[model samples]
Target: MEQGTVKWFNAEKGFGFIERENGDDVFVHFSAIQGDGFKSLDEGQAVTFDVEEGQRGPQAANVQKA
Candidate 1:
């Protein structure tokens, strides 16, 4: 129910980084990004997502184009 912008690279099929409304960029795995085709981001695209705390906390998930 939250979202952020994709400005960093995703290393494709692995993981990536994106900046939230916050000053820090949250790291999101490509797998975490929810989409059948848009596994990769547009780079500098706005997307819908949510935050979760794991061993890798602040990770973004349920990602979708905005």
Candidate 2:
């Protein structure tokens, strides 16, 4: 798993992008976010997730925004 922050998110669209501590950006889908807490996704929120190589780029899996 890796630590990161929700640099950008769109609740209406249920999709977002995370900026990792290593300065990498990962795609985040609402489906990957767990719990009802994720419904209020916002910027500057701390998070952790597994990384996987996506077809286009990097993506977050099992993401949890702290």
Best by lDDT: 2
lDDT of 1: 0.73
Q: Highest TM-score: which candidate? A: 2
Candidate 1 ranges beyond 4 A from true positions: none
Candidate 1, pairs of clashing residues: none
Per-residue lDDT of model 2, residues 1-66, tens digit only: 588888888778878788877777888877787757436456887888887889997878787655
Model 2 residue 43 lDDT score? 85
Quantify all predictions' global Cα lDDT against the true fold: 0.73, 0.78
Clashing pairs in 2: none
Cα lDDT of model 1 by residue, 1-66, tens digit: 577778776564477777877746787887787757545777777887777776746877767668
Q: For each candidate, how many residue pairs have backbone atoms clashing (under 3 Å)?
A: 0, 0
Task: Find the number of clashing residue pairs for candidate 1.
Answer: 0
Worst 10 residues of 2 by lDDT: 33-42
